[PDB]
Amino acid sequence: PTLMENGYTYEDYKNTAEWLLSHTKHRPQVAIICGSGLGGLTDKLTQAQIFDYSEIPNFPRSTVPGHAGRLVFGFLNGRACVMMQGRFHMYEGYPLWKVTFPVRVFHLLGVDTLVVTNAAGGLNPKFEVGDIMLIRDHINLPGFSGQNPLRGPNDERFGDRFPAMSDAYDRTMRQRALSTWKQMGEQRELQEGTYVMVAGPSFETVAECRVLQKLGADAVGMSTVPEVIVARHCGLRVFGFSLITNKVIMDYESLEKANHEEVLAAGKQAAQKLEQFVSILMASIPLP
Amino acid sequence: MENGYTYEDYKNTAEWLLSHTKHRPQVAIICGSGLGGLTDKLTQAQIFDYSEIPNFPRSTVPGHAGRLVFGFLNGRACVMMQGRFHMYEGYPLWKVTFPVRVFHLLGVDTLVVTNAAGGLNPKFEVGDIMLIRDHINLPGFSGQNPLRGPNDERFGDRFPAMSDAYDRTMRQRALSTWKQMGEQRELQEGTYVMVAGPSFETVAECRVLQKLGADAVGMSTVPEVIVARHCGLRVFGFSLITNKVIMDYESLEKANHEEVLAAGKQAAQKLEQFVSILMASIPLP
Amino acid sequence: TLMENGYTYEDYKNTAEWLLSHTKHRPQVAIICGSGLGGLTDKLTQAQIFDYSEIPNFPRSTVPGHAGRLVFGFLNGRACVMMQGRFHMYEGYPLWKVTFPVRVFHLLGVDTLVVTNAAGGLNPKFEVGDIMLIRDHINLPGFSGQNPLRGPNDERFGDRFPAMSDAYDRTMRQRALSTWKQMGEQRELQEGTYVMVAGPSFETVAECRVLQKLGADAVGMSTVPEVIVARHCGLRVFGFSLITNKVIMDYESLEKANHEEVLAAGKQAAQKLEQFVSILMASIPLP
Ligand SMILES: Nc1nc2c(CN3C[C@H](CO)[C@@H](O)C3)c[nH]c2c(=O)[nH]1
Ligand SMILES: Nc1nc2c(CN3C[C@H](CO)[C@@H](O)C3)c[nH]c2c(=O)[nH]1
Ligand SMILES: Nc1nc2c(CN3C[C@H](CO)[C@@H](O)C3)c[nH]c2c(=O)[nH]1
Structure with missing residues (x-):
């Protein structure tokens, strides 16, 4: 009981991959993980098939709202996709080997590209x-x-x-x-910068926000990095963006507080603009 | 993974306390290393050993008595943790902070946390x-x-x-x-950085901690604070600066707990006076 | 539910005694050899070799370039024991296993530990x-x-x-x-701060910037736990890194840190290492 390794065996990832392949005719090339309140990115997929995480062997469940907890196969602008409608987080109690389970099953599925989105x-x-x-x-x-x-x-x-x-x-x-x-x-530019992952589930203090700034981070969140790390380790191409849902409080004067309701609502607002961006991007993803 | 305590555990504990004392505190006070001497002014004091109280962790570091003391302090109904729990003792933060959710179930609405730093x-x-x-x-x-x-x-x-x-x-x-x-010494206000220990900082670490903007370093406090706010308690915190962390390589001085406890003892009267004035500052329910 | 050393005092003693029974050497100095630095054992004389698998309670080394052997002998006429390879957190080890050897070195009579690593x-x-x-x-x-x-x-x-x-x-x-x-040489000895990071994956450019601005001169994934328990039991401690590679500092560079070049830089450095370690041995005080 000493060694801390993956609770998941290779044949574990395989069983799930297989199960999926026996349950859908879709054969995705691009996997997309939809962050908090971004679950709307699945709206535009055609010939869609939906699986509840509960159905898929070994899959964790989303417990945080609104992460719908569903896996969705479809076409998006010429490309066969699989979308994570809801992800998993360390703060929910999951070890990162669980948080990242789906990524290596995408690889066994034959996905060569992963796009990762999150609120931030x-x-x-x-x-x-x-x-x-x-x-x-x-x-x-x-x-x-x-x-x-x-x-x-x-x-x-x-x-x-x-x-x-x-x-x-x-x-x-x-x-x-x-x-x-x-x-x-668009009026606003496409923004570019460094994402810092922090475990949560509680939100930065003012001093914490300041270290993070000092560290050179442009955006903070509690996900995404594990998934990127396991994707790149199996040789997937990785592309990410964050939806800026709140400016984290950087002074003791403000009486504003960061909260989930506000972040889910910045998500519903933008998911429109978001889906379009993702859509046009698909035809930019290099073919196998 | 998860907190090992079910909701019933915290309840069992609170009810145990609620039926073994007639005291009903409003303020909870956690006493850090060498701050155990702050239970001394509790009037009509009632004392329990952590080992009496269902689910209570034990205090294993010197300077932490392992005792829960109910009483009135400068008029105010308090319960005091005489000794606390740290991560470096091998406790998961869900044990370190356990008492705090119980205090809340006691009806405590304010928490003061104290440490050496x-x-x-x-x-x-x-x-x-x-x-x-x-x-x-x-x-x-x-x-x-x-x-x-x-x-x-x-x-x-x-x-x-x-x-x-x-x-x-x-x-x-x-x-x-x-x-x-x-006093002639002003009162200080700054940032506490929690660091897990149990070993003391290098000069290099001291310097990251400084340039991270933190004014004092300890190994406690933050988890308790976090869970207190989670349940809506009002939170006040203070540190007794017991040592100056070593910031150059030519100093032959080095951090030790004895100096920490020594400085705790030195300031025991000044803390007690400060905490007394502080009971006069807390709003009523 | 307590995070806790899995080893008792008796376990550290069972191991130490076993070594004491099976070797005639009484080492004063212990040397931990990092990634690709195994060849430091070469200049030991009257050597005696134990595979870690033979030693009760000894973890095993799974990374390439960590031989997994404990070697006694003399170096520049000093009694040394050398770890031929070490253990790392990323391998799945609890820090209480990583550092296990150090307390046994202590129960053996060792009073100085020299830690080595790649960085x-x-x-x-x-x-x-x-x-x-x-x-x-x-x-x-x-x-x-x-x-x-x-x-x-x-x-x-x-x-x-x-x-x-x-x-x-x-x-x-x-x-x-x-x-x-x-x-x-025309090249000076370097001096500076080791920052330990867990891995196993290598720093991003951004992470590389945070480490720089934290004051740190070199990054590795070990060593520090070993040093902490050494000082716990009052061993004199000396450490050094071999700079095996420069961490990627900008986004247009096409270089990537890889294990293979870590090990290569080590084999390229063997002679200079040998010379240094034995010039170090001369600088270690006698009991
Ligand atoms: N840590 C952190 N995360 C976020 C996020 C991203 N997620 C949003 C959700 C909490 O609303 C968590 O899963 C993290 C948005 N804003 C913030 C913030 O200010 N801080
Ligand atoms: N980390 C740290 N903590 C402290 C403390 C606070 N506690 C003091 C005690 C060890 O003496 C630990 O439980 C933490 C006082 N001085 C220092 C210091 O220099 N460093
Ligand atoms: N973090 C880090 N460690 C190292 C090391 C030291 N070890 C080398 C080995 C990976 O090849 C790990 O055990 C860490 C060499 N170069 C580097 C680097 O660029 N980064």
């Missing part, structure tokens, strides 16, 4: 709510201290022992998302 | 009292947070805010009321 | 192949729970609350520094 608190002063931020890079604070989904024995059928994360955010797609933005009719 | 701000001297204006939860950042796991709505919200954590009224009130202490 | 270079002044002497460390896993001393403290080993501000011996530093002018 604004740390950079010139962001505004409703801004989409292209995740250039992240800072894995839980990672530094030992909280990493890769911890334990490493299966080379999936990846290396020491996989480099410094090219994690696909540079090609950044450049393409950038100029693709001049193609939407 | 190392001084990061060069302006601080041993003996100072630093009001906890804010904290940095370094262990929180990576998963060690007492709220981790399923949330019980009966206590609070899945995502509670912490930027309002330390009552601005009670701090400002404490700041003005400080001239009654007859 | 990514953070300080722009460092070249691949430099030896940075660890003047100090930053213990990030320690900041948030991960410390080998967590749980009940055994007072037979040391304090409930030990100081680390003096962890790396000043006198050994200075002696090592001034002794460097011989089989020295």
Whole structure:
């Protein structure tokens, strides 16, 4: 009982992959994880098939609202997709080996690209709510201290022992998302910066917000990084963005408080603009 | 994963207390290392051993008596933790903070937390009292947070805010009321950074902690605060700066608990006077 | 439900006695050899080799370039025991297993521990192949729970609350520094802060920026727990890194840190390492 490794065996991921393949004719190339209140990104998929997480062997469940807890296969702008409508978080009590389960089943499914979205608190002063931020890079604070989904024995059928994360955010797609933005009719620029992961479930104090700023983080949240780390370890291309849902309180004067109701509501507002952005992006994702 | 205590556990404990004392506290006071001497002014004091009270962890560090004391302090109905619990003892934060949810079930509506702290701000001297204006939860950042796991709505919200954590009224009130202490040392206010220990900082660590903007360092307090706010208790916090953390390589001085307890003892009368004035500052239910 | 050392005092004693029974060596100095640094055992004389698998209670090393062997012998005429490879948190080990050998080294009679490691270079002044002497460390896993001393403290080993501000011996530093002018080079000995990070995956550019701005000169994934328990039981401690690679600092670079080049830089550094370690041995005080 000493060793802290994955509770999931390789054949565990396999069983789930298989089950999915025997239960849908869809064969996705792109997997999309929808953050808090962003569950609306599945609206535009055609010929859609829905599975409740409860149906899928080994799948965790979403306990936080509104993470719908459903897996959805569809086409989006020429491309076969699978979408996580709701994700999992460390703060819910899950070990990162659970949080990230689906990612390696996508790989066994044959997905070669993963897009990750999340709600995120604004740390950079010139962001505004409703801004989409292209995740250039992240800072894995839980990672530094030992909280990493890769911890334990490493299966080379999936990846290396020491996989480099410094090219994690696909540079090609950044450049393409950038100029693709001049193609939407938008007032605000597409935002770019570093996402810092923090465990939660409680929200930053003012001093904490200030370390995070000092650290160089542009946005804070409690997800996403584990998933990126396991994706890149199996060689998926990774592309991420955060929806800026609130500016995290950076002075003792404010009487504003960060809260879930407000973040879910910044999500419903933007999901429209979001889905379109994701839509045009699909035709930018490189073919297998 | 999850908190090992069911809701009934906290209830059992509260009811045990509610039927073994007639005291009904409004304020709960957690006593840090060398601050155990603050139960001394409790009138009509009633004392329990942590080992009597169902589900109570034990205090295993010297300077932590392992005793729960109900009484009145400068008129106010208090219950005091004479000794506390740390993460480095091998306790999950859901044990470290356990009493706090119980106090809430007792009807306590205010929590004061006290600790010893190392001084990061060069302006601080041993003996100072630093009001906890804010904290940095370094262990929180990576998963060690007492709220981790399923949330019980009966206590609070899945995502509670912490930027309002330390009552601005009670701090400002404490700041003005400080001239009654007859002191020449000003009253300090700054940031507490929790660090898990049990080993003391390197010079290099001291320096990250400084440049992270923190004024004092300890290994306690933050989890308790977090769960108190989760259930809506008013929170006041202060630190006794017991040592100045080592910030250069040519000093031959080094942090030790003995110096910590020694400085606790030195300031025992000044704390007691300060905490007394503080009971006059808490709003009534 | 208590996070706690899984080893009793008796376990550390069972292991130490076993070594004492099976070897005639009585080591004064213990050396932990990191990734790709195994060849430091080469210059040991009258050597005797134990596979970790033979040693009661010894963990095993699963990373490549960590041989998994305990080697006794003399080096520059000093009685050493060398760990041929070590253990890391990322392997799934609790810090109380990672550092297990150190207390047994202590029960063996060892009074000095020298920790060695590979490290990514953070300080722009460092070249691949430099030896940075660890003047100090930053213990990030320690900041948030991960410390080998967590749980009940055994007072037979040391304090409930030990100081680390003096962890790396000043006198050994200075002696090592001034002794460097011989089989020295046009390249100086480096000195600086090791930051420990858990891994197993390598730093992003952003993470690399936070480490730099935290004051840290080199990054690795071990060592610090070993140092903490060494000082717990009052061993003199000396540390150094081999800068095996420069951590990626900007987004257009196409280089990526990889294990293979960590090990290569090690084999490339063997001779200079050998020379240094034995010049170090001369700088270690006698009982
Ligand atoms: N840590 C943090 N996370 C977020 C998020 C992202 N998630 C939103 C949800 C809480 O509303 C958690 O799952 C984290 C939005 N804003 C913030 C913030 O200010 N802070
Ligand atoms: N981390 C830290 N804590 C303290 C404390 C607070 N407590 C003192 C006690 C060890 O003496 C621990 O339980 C933490 C006083 N001084 C210091 C210091 O220099 N550092
Ligand atoms: N974190 C980190 N560690 C190392 C190390 C030290 N060890 C090398 C090995 C990965 O090859 C791990 O055990 C850590 C060398 N280079 C680096 C680096 O760039 N980064």
